[PDB]
Write a protein that binds this ligand. Structure first.
Ligand code: COY
Ligand code: COY
Ligand SMILES: [K+]
Ligand SMILES: [K+]
Ligand SMILES: [K+]
Ligand SMILES: [K+]
Lengths: 178, 551, 137, 551, 137, 178
């Protein structure tokens, strides 16, 4: 595998670290995203995005909800920078920030099948730029009128399955590297 | 060896669609599931003690809300004891009046009315829908978006859509911080195309309410409710917060509806083992219980979920019929892509188009689907001629009309000009005359000159930060010489002052005349009665482009 | 009380919609907007109007719609930012029971929003049972 | 400068369709024309003296035929006096029995029943059609043709079509002299796919009857009638020649129906100023009067004529409803191209598909339309997956089912091999193994080796001139290793001896069991009654390709 | 008299249906086809069968269908080529009145086809009036 | 103006001609077919196809019906060879033969928009070859599923207009061709 819980995740310190909050089945019951991009590669480009911006990249697995907004929110609480990136096993991703209501965000990627590894790295990059309070220009908008026709039912099944690993009230876990 | 017949079949667009075998235990089944609860109710001293098998001691927040406010308790035992097959028969019987049925259906429990309508085929449902629809006159609602959030385009498209006949129009954002621009653009352009057209800008709940407080919208619709408590919770609300929100809009004079639609709970992971239709019924009763006049439903954004399973498109018509049978306005979806197939999407639309609903679609895309920011509608701008042709073919009023290129061009032009004046007066990032001619002639954002997102977004966010209101838009209209439009704008706010358009199914037509279920009473009683396409409106519908005069 | 026969108000009884301000529909003119004879609040619907519409709804056979309009008439007294505050307070896991009861007392005592206070108090006891308060997540 | 919006619209396939402004004086109006006669009848000593305006002195052969044989004179005065709106309400009321209506409609004049259905919208008409349909079980009919008259291909396509669910299949010729081969190929291939499928070969009237007399067909349908005398005359018949022909088929034990369809009289130059629906009602009464059990109508081959004008597709549903309402089997068209638009042809089809008729289509093309020798059908082989998906979406029994490529290949192969044995046994131009394989895997004639049409036509010719009958086919199959198929052919021949399938709507299902309106009585009484898609048939329809099991 | 309770004949009363030449349904076997014990001439519906079916149609509320069946029963006695001649005779402009009346006399006197004879004389009379006889085009 | 009526056509006496029989508005109130080919050009090519095969072409205008089968039957009645070609103004064409029922033919061209001047000449050629009792292979099939969608309404309108010039009982006129 590639992900190792290394205890309950502790509050951030420095405002120059970005947390990647991962759904409760990411890299476990599910290893690839809705179109086959592997979780390790996705974590790989996300981290590489942040780091190369010169910011720390911390990763936790979220438990109290499988909803991408809420798992991102879980992360923004602990991110020393207040910026976090929420990611579901199917691949849907969000860049959050403390002070925003859960169903608000900095940037949303609401059609997972359109994401690419190149998109994942941009997201990490941007998250880092936000963490330095840099105001990056947003990742270019991806949209396809047939994405739902082709993938929404599958998205549903994947979400159903990931959702079976939600633990109410359980605190995010810190995770170690490849 | 392969069959070339099957090779040809394999290439057809419909086989790109998502299809799934039913998954009863996870509620991945559209309707008629063996897990749905048997209808039941118990009442003691005016309060519900049992609802559809469940004791009050076990009620979740949805059960409590529906039990305490969503059901006509005065006739609930009466109706519970009636045969569901007879009640379904009453629903489609042309000689049982809507006014005789509403007291009974509104007294039914969610499982009861689901049981009733599940006895019906789609022909029976349509026969019933035309009677149960609250507004006598059918209408139509459009999406007015683009992948750039380009405001001059939104104003142009808005104007054209109003001119083609939409009585409500909806915008939303590719990038959320653009929202105030979109809203103002949509309002202005809508009033240019036909004064009285209602506009909304769909956002997260607290954000949308504030834009409405500031006067940059005339109603709200994407006020979501869900049919299981865990899903509702992930939706970040309860029936009480959404009920409070509903009344908050009304307290500011704004018309609003909730939004629901089959498949959301499956999509969001907790169906509690129930059918999409049964969970949707709970959504409809949540709407009723909240005192909300109307509802956007028919799967709406979740349409890939019921459409993947058997009888999903029938379930979508059934949930629209439950909505209207509960004496709620129904904005009946037909606004979201679920298929690569034209045949298939047409069958899905006709279910509502043929009988007519309060809004046949709750977001026909008035732009090409590449520009649709709800990830595509079941119809778009390139379908307008087809839609008009089918109206003519069947003598069905689908709420829209053939138009002249010359008129559309003029109308898109005055709207781009108006928004241009507004940005001036408001000191917003300028809309060049360049931009104005392009939005005049555009099909979509691919025909528009790129703008400075940064400057726009900056001024957009400031409209809300600095609470810049509608008056600013109105003055700027007046200042730049668009008094007419500025008056029209004024007239919307006026409607807000009277409260008349808060009622069931209200739209505003002609010279600021409200048209709602209260004063446009659907009186269907079979052939030759109720709304009939005829007279000048039929003449208008007959007049499609390309009809050659035979002599 | 207002009846369906009284609707639309704008058409049949426009003088019943005189603002609390006491100035009619006809006063809402571009010119008046320009000269600042009419201003942003000026176009605030009144509780009076909402109670009118509530009665018509009732008359129309729509009791829950009437009820919504009654809550709404009450809520006209609550300032915009306060409206948002209370809405957010009702969202899952935002509040303690005591905080919700405080909101309801407030509604009742400061704004005489009786019905809305009862609605919030209702929310408060059921959020306890169904575990939607702060810390229940 | 052009609008890019309008430029995109101008390119849509629907704008290639032919549209026309109504031309009332020439009858180029689908229905509800101001020139249509007011319903009336006058009877003196048992003989009609006035009919729908016209005095008996002015009757043409059509008036005479209808006044003497088409109307129940014993109740005609009573029914004329009834209110046409109430009667229309009766048609769609689920609680007014079919058996209560038929005594009334069969006493109506043509103008009277047209006046009745013209008060109805299409939803009401569909509500009515599901009830008035004579056979409880809806069915389907296909065309099996190809542009080369390739007999191997026709047998294979016919087997596949029978396997997919068609209960009747129809061939015709690119080159008329090929007819006997086409007929035999169709019959053999049809019995291989499903023993019991009925077959016809549509030709000039005398030629088709002779073919039937030789035993190479199971029924005839394209027995044309027309609604004005001059047009009927150019159709080279009169009501009396066509009634004699009807009885001639029955005297040979052959099932038959007439064909008519709105717009024929316009197309053929003499509408006598009347609407298409009114003239089609005359056709429907000619059929009744002749004592013919059923009718192919719904414009049929003239569909570009009513479709060109307002309410033409509504008129098409109406003529179908008049047909069923007059207690005739209705083979309801959906068999001919009228549009370039998938949206538009879907709307036209659903009018019959949703309620169900005796034959939802009278000629779905079971070949790609390039091979369709009636110049294109409203559906073709490439639409099969779409059709099945819509059945599943709506829970509607459209008569067809999903099928496995390997079953289709096995069945096409068997049909070609049986026909190969037929040609060898009868000494006809060989069918080679290579042709058997290509027919097996073909999509259409493009996949078939070319044949020597000189040799084929010479022997086809000699089948006629030497009166080679249907038992020759049975022997060659029996002698050629196809005893099962031989038995099935013999069985369908035996059906001609009993008269059973001569009754209203008869098809033959299961193990040679006749299924007609006499023993499969439609008993609709609203929701949860009458024919309902359910049980194993529903499971069959649910099982489309691509439906992945979620778990 | 047959009723819809008697239908289908093949199931309810196969015996009633015995052909042209005293063959029964069960006489039509592959073996008998192959030995020529049965041939096309045996495989012909009878006037009796068609009159039974006519009675069932009437019982089903379909009198004109019955009358068609009654005409067909008569025509079973007319040979295939004569059937085609008479059909063609009735088509517009093929026949003179006297030729139609002679077909009618022949139907009656040679085949006892009195209904069809009546049918053809009715066409002759109306073919005069509507001008669809030889020479009228 | 290219067609002159020169008297009631008489019966041909030898098997050395093909009659071309045209509807009663051909070259008069209508002067092009459904897709705009000039009547003049159509007549030219059919005549050339016939003459090309060493047979006489004789042209008549028919009045008793505007239906192309009955038009052609009027012509086969008068043709020395028993063979005729029926042509409506809109372009529909049939090769007919003395002896056949009106609605039977040797070859039919039932989708007039698909005909070209090359088709019309081939039709003349085949007609001549029938005349001479050869058994010509038929002109290849033209079919198009969208022909009715595009043109059936227009075809009805052109037929309505030609049909106004029908005259019951008026015998065909022999035509001089400019
Ligand atoms: C399907 C959909 C949903 C539905 C499923 C959501 C889910 N959580 O499972 C639905 C209807 C329940 C829904 C709700 C909301 C709620 C949030 C609830 C939540 N917890 O997610 C929402 C806040 C609205 C509200 N009034 O509360 C919300 C919004 C605003 C948006 C926008 C987000 C803007 C932003 N934040 O930057 C958005 C871009 C539309 C827009 N242009 O405004 C869109 C993503 C908007 C999308 C438009 C777009 N441009 O993409 C759209 C239309 C298509 C996405 C898709 O199918 N992708 C294909 C799929 C295979 O890829 P995927 O990666 O698996 O897709 C996932 C993400 O999109 C995610 N997701 C969807 N919305 C959303 C929002 C946020 C903030 C986050 C973090 C994640 C969100 O869910 C899907 C499936 O898991 C979509 N949604 Co929602 C759309 C709301 C429309 C009106 C209400 N409505 C419509 N139908 C019904 C119904 N039947 N019942 C009840 N309500 C509704 N949505 N949505 N949504
Ligand atoms: C539309 C059509 C008609 C209709 C119009 C006829 C008309 N005269 O106006 C219709 C339905 C009334 C009709 C009748 C017949 C009668 C002839 C009547 C007559 N006087 O012409 C017919 C004898 C059937 C019968 N039972 O009697 C007949 C036949 C056999 C044929 C075939 C001719 C074979 C041949 N001779 O080589 C044919 C090729 C089909 C086939 N594969 O067998 C086809 C031409 C068959 C055609 C299939 C095909 N492969 O082309 C098809 C389907 C398409 C033609 C088209 O739209 N072209 C496009 C148009 C723009 O071009 P156009 O040049 O203007 O087209 C003209 C010619 O086709 C001409 N024409 C049409 N048929 C025909 C036949 C003859 C012998 C001649 C000389 C000229 C004929 O009419 C049109 C319009 O002016 C066609 N018809 Co008719 C098909 C019959 C189908 C079953 C009955 N039926 C279906 N619908 C209805 C209805 N509403 N009412 C009543 N009956 C019917 N037809 N048709 N028809
Ligand atoms: K729902
Ligand atoms: K909408
Ligand atoms: K007709
Ligand atoms: K057919």
């Amino acid at each position: 595998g590639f992900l190792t819980e290394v205890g309950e995740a502790r509050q951030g310190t420095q405002q120059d670290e970005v947390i990647i909050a991962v759904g409760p089945a990411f890299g476990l019951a599910q290893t690839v995203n809705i179109v086959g991009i592997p979780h390790k590669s996705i974590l790989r480009e996300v981290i590489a995005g942040i780091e190369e911006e010169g910011i720390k990249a911390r990763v936790i697995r979220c438990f109290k909800s499988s909803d991408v907004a809420f798992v991102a929110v879980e992360g923004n609480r602990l991110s020393g920078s207040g910026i976090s990136i929420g990611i579901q096993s199917k691949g849907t991703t969000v860049i959050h920030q403390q002070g925003l209501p859960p169903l608000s965000n900095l940037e949303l990627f609401p059609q997972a099948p359109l994401l690419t590894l190149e998109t994942y790295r941009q997201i990490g990059k941007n998250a880092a730029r936000y963490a330095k309070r840099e105001s990056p220009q947003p990742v270019p908008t991806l949209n396809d009128q047939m994405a739902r026709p082709k993938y929404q039912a599958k998205s549903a099944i994947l979400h159903i399955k990931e959702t079976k690993y939600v633990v109410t009230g359980k605190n995010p876990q810190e995770l170690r590297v490849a | 060896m392969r069959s070339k017949r099957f090779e040809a079949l394999a290439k057809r667009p419909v086989n790109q669609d998502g299809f799934v075998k039913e998954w009863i235990e996870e509620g991945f089944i559209a309707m008629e599931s063996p897990n749905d609860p048997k209808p039941s109710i118990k009442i003691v001293n005016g309060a519900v003690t049992e609802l559809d098998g469940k004791p009050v001691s076990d009620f979740d927040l949805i059960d409590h809300f529906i039990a305490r406010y969503g059901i006509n308790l005065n006739r609930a035992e009466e109706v519970m004891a009636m045969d569901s097959v007879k009640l379904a028969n009453m629903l489609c019987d042309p000689n049982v009046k809507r006014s005789e049925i509403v007291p009974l259906t509104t007294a039914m429990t969610p499982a009861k009315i689901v049981e009733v309508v599940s006895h019906m085929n789609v022909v029976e449902m349509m026969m019933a829908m035309q009677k149960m629809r609250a507004r006598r006159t059918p209408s139509q609602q459009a999406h007015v978006t683009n992948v750039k959030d380009n405001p001059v385009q939104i104003a142009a498209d808005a104007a054209e859509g109003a001119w083609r006949g939409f009585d409500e129009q909806e915008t939303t954002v590719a990038v959320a911080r653009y929202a105030p621009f979109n809203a103002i653009a949509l309002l202005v352009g809508s009033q240019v195309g036909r004064p009285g057209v209602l506009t909304q800008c769909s956002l997260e709940e607290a954000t949308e309410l504030k834009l409405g407080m500031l006067g940059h919208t005339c109603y709200a619709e994407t006020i979501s409710v869900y049919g299981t408590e865990p899903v509702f919770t992930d939706g970040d609300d309860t029936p009480w917060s959404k009920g409070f929100l509903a009344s908050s809009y009304a307290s500011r004079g704004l018309k609003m509806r909730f939004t629901s639609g089959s498949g959301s709970e499956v999509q969001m992971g907790y169906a509690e083992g129930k059918s999409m239709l049964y969970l949707e019924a709970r959504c409809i009763y949540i709407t009723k219980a909240a005192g909300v006049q109307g509802l956007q439903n028919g799967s709406v954004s979740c349409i890939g979920v019921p459409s993947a399973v058997p009888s999903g498109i029938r379930a979508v018509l059934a949930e629209n019929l439950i909505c209207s049978s509960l004496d709620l306005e129904c904005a009946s979806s037909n606004d979201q892509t679920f298929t690569h197939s034209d045949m298939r999407r047409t069958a899905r639309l006709l279910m509502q188009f043929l009988p007519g609903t309060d809004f046949i679609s709750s977001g026909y895309s008035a732009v090409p689907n590449y520009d649709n920011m709800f990830a595509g509608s079941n119809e778009d701008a390139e379908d307008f001629d087809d839609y008009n042709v089918i109206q003519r073919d069947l003598k069905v009023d689908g709420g829209l009309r053939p138009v002249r290129e010359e008129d559309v061009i003029a109308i898109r032009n005055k709207a781009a000009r108006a928004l241009q004046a507004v940005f001036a007066g408001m000191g917003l990032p300028p809309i060049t005359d360049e931009e104005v001619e392009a939005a005049t002639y555009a099909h979509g954002s691919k025909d528009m000159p790129e703008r400075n997102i940064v400057e726009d977004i900056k001024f957009a966010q400031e409209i809300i930060n600095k609470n810049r209101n509608g008056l600013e838009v109105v003055k700027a209209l007046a200042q730049g010489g668009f008094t007419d439009v500025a008056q029209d704008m004024l007239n919307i706010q006026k409607a807000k002052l009277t409260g008349d358009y808060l009622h069931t199914s209200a739209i505003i037509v002609g010279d600021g005349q409200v048209l709602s279920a209260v004063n446009d009473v659907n009186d269907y009683a079979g052939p030759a009665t109720g709304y009939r396409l005829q007279g000048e409106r039929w003449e208008e519908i007959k007049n499609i482009p390309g009809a050659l005069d035979p002599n | 009380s207002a009846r369906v026969s009284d609707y639309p108000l704008a058409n049949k009884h426009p003088e019943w919609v005189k603002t609390a301000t006491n100035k009619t529909l006809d006063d809402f003119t571009l010119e008046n907007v320009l000269s600042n004879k009419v201003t942003a609040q000026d176009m605030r619907i009144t509780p009076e109007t909402l109670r009118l519409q509530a009665s018509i709804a009732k008359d129309a056979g729509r009791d829950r719609l009437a009820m919504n309009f009654e809550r709404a008439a009450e809520l006209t007294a609550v300032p915009d930012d306060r409206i948002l505050e209370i809405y957010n307070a009702l969202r899952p896991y935002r509040s303690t029971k005591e905080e919700l009861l405080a909101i309801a007392d407030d509604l009742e005592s400061r704004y005489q929003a009786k019905i809305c206070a009862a609605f919030v108090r209702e929310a408060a006891t059921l959020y306890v049972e169904r575990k939607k308060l702060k810390g229940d997540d």
